[PDB]
Design a protein around this ligand. Structure first.
Ligand SMILES: [Ca+2]
Length: 187
């Protein structure tokens, strides 16, 4: 596609995994490594995606995805992932998530840093970083067709005034794309 964002998809490293319910587990926790978790919440009927990145290797160790999970359940699942990966810190897109998730992150003692995806400018910085790392052969994800498809279908458009926009082709989703970009913002 002429308007592909991820022109370096050919350099994406593809990793085998075990599906454990809502998790795709590439590898279990290694305590000599430091991890973070990109978190795109399930604000309403959209998916929540939590991407555990090994910051020593640049590889996704685990990716959890679901939709329709309660807000509290999303936070509990994030807590469990964080704890599983050595109190991995969460890079949380807190923009427009609502008071309950924001309060729950603090109330539950989640190890997190806010990265609100609050404009097209912020989004472009996150995505361009992911795209560059990808072309450089530094991005490694679970070899799952849904993940690869969501990256393949992430495209450039232009607004009425001529500003750049990045979004899913057609009527698609970008929760996986954004979760991965949030994780890799730290790499
Ligand atoms: Ca979402």
């Amino acid at each position: 596609a002429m308007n592909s964002v991820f022109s370096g998809l050919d350099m994406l490293i593809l990793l085998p995994y075990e599906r454990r319910g809502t998790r795709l587990v590439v590898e279990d926790y290694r305590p000599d490594h430091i991890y973070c978790i990109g978190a795109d919440f399930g604000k309403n009927q959209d998916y929540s995606v939590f991407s555990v990145l090994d910051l020593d290797t640049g590889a996704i160790a685990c990716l959890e995805r679901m939709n329709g999970a309660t807000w509290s359940d999303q936070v509990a699942r994030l807590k469990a992932l964080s704890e599983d990966y050595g109190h991995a810190y969460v890079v949380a897109d807190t923009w427009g998530v609502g008071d309950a998730i924001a309060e729950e992150l603090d109330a539950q003692g989640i190890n997190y840093t806010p990265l609100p995806v609050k404009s097209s400018s912020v989004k472009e910085q996150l995505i361009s970083n992911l795209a560059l790392l990808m072309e450089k052969g530094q991005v490694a994800v679970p070899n799952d067709k849904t993940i690869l498809d969501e990256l393949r279908n992430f495209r450039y458009y232009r607004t009425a005034s001529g500003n750049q926009v990045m979004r899913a082709y057609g009527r698609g989703h970008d929760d996986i794309v954004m979760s991965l970009a949030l994780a890799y913002s730290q790499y």
